């Protein structure tokens, strides 16, 4: 996160880390056994970290659980980034407390102007790299579709939305992929992509979760 702040311990209990030696993405815990993340975050043998705040610290409520199924959307296009969503099944049910907890899927789509909390351990610079020891947060309004397509002409599908600031200075960044966009307590988005980080008229682009609630619930029931 660029231009954000320290979330603090246990404020974002649904935020998970995806690891394979290194942190490469984030994701969101939607029940004790299932995480939502980005489809371009896929790789075999993902280790999931729950209850994390400080990455240099092994916290007590921290949980380290390997994925047992990493299910990419049937229609994920690696070339357009359309349908950039993935479901990860944890090898065993995680322990739910105040440091580890779920986030609700939405019943309906969020509207433009809605303030959302986006979080990650990703890069905090717009040029060159700087990773935080602690989780970073940012509040960001959801932008209208018209603004979003003006920023990214021909590149915004029906399953993407823009959030952030057209002036720049505040945005998600590299390392934040898969991480939550939470608006009014619902999981409305997934960190997906952008052109650079926090650059003017180039807001972050996010996977529109509300279009996938059916697929998510169906996939969970069948696995």
């Amino acid at each position: 996160i660029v231009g954000g702040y320290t979330c603090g311990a246990n404020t974002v209990p649904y935020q998970v880390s995806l690891n394979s030696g290194y942190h490469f993405c984030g994701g969101s815990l939607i029940n004790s056994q299932w995480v939502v993340s980005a489809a371009h975050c896929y790789k075999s043998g993902i280790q999931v970290r729950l209850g994390e705040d400080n990455i240099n610290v092994v916290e007590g409520n921290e949980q380290f659980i390997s994925a047992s199924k990493s299910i990419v959307h049937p229609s994920y296009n690696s070339n357009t980034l359309n349908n950039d969503i993935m479901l990860i099944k944890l090898k065993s049910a995680a322990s739910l407390n105040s440091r580890v907890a779920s986030i609700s899927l939405p019943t309906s789509c969020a509207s433009a102007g809605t303030q959302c909390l986006i979080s990650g351990w990703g890069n905090t610079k717009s040029s060159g790299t700087s990773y935080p020891d602690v989780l970073k947060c940012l509040k960001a309004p959801i932008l209208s579709d018209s603004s979003c397509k003006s920023a990214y002409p021909g590149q915004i599908t029906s399953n993407m939305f823009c959030a952030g600031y057209l002036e720049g200075g505040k945005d998600s960044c590299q390392g934040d992929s898969g991480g939550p966009v939470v608006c009014s307590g619902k999981l409305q988005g997934i960190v997906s992509w952008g052109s650079g980080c926090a650059q003017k008229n180039k807001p972050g682009v996010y996977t529109k979760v509300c279009n996938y609630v059916s697929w998510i619930k169906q996939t969970i029931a069948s696995n």
Binding site: Y22, H40, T80, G128, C173, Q174, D176, W193
Partner: protein
């Protein structure tokens, strides 16, 4: 396989690196130069001097994953420290493959993904251009300038060194 720097760390998405020859004896890092009639250093070349690291490159891809893999289509651009007056007010210095010459140039005045990939090559790595994928190598002009061009079957073997830390 995976992409590693000289410190044996996986390459970071959005990271800045020097791009150095994997072997040694001929040339140093990648940098900018003028060739032919251009009045401003727009050609990506390899430094003639072995001791020179050149100009560091930002290598990134639009999805906001933390790392880079051989699979990812890459945007590559030189960093903008201490530039000539000619380039001085440009934000980014992206690489673009240009002309019938298929030379790698910076295109300061201008699709979803980039046209480059990094691929393993023996015990190091090579840069490929995907219009499919062709190795980038060095073509030495008649003034001994060491131009990075599209050059299938003859890749320049590179290794990545962090510019910071």
């Amino acid at each position: 396989k995976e992409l590693l720097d000289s410190d044996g760390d996986i390459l970071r998405n959005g990271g800045t690196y020097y791009i150095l020859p994997a072997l040694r004896g001929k040339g140093g890092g990648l940098e900018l130069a003028k060739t032919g009639d251009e009045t401003c250093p727009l050609n990506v070349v390899q430094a003639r001097s072995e001791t020179k690291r050149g100009r560091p490159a930002i290598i990134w891809t639009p999805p906001r994953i933390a790392i880079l893999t051989p699979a990812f289509y890459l945007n590559i651009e030189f960093q903008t420290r201490d530039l000539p007056a000619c380039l001085e007010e440009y934000s980014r210095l992206p690489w673009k493959v240009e002309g019938e010459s298929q030379e790698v140039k910076i295109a300061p005045k201008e699709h979803l993904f980039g046209s480059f990939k990094i691929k393993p090559y023996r015990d190091d790595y090579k840069l490929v251009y995907c219009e499919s994928c062709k190795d980038l190598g060095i073509s030495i002009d008649d003034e001994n300038n060491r131009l990075l061009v599209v050059k299938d079957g003859d890749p320049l073997a590179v290794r990545f060194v962090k510019a910071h830390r």
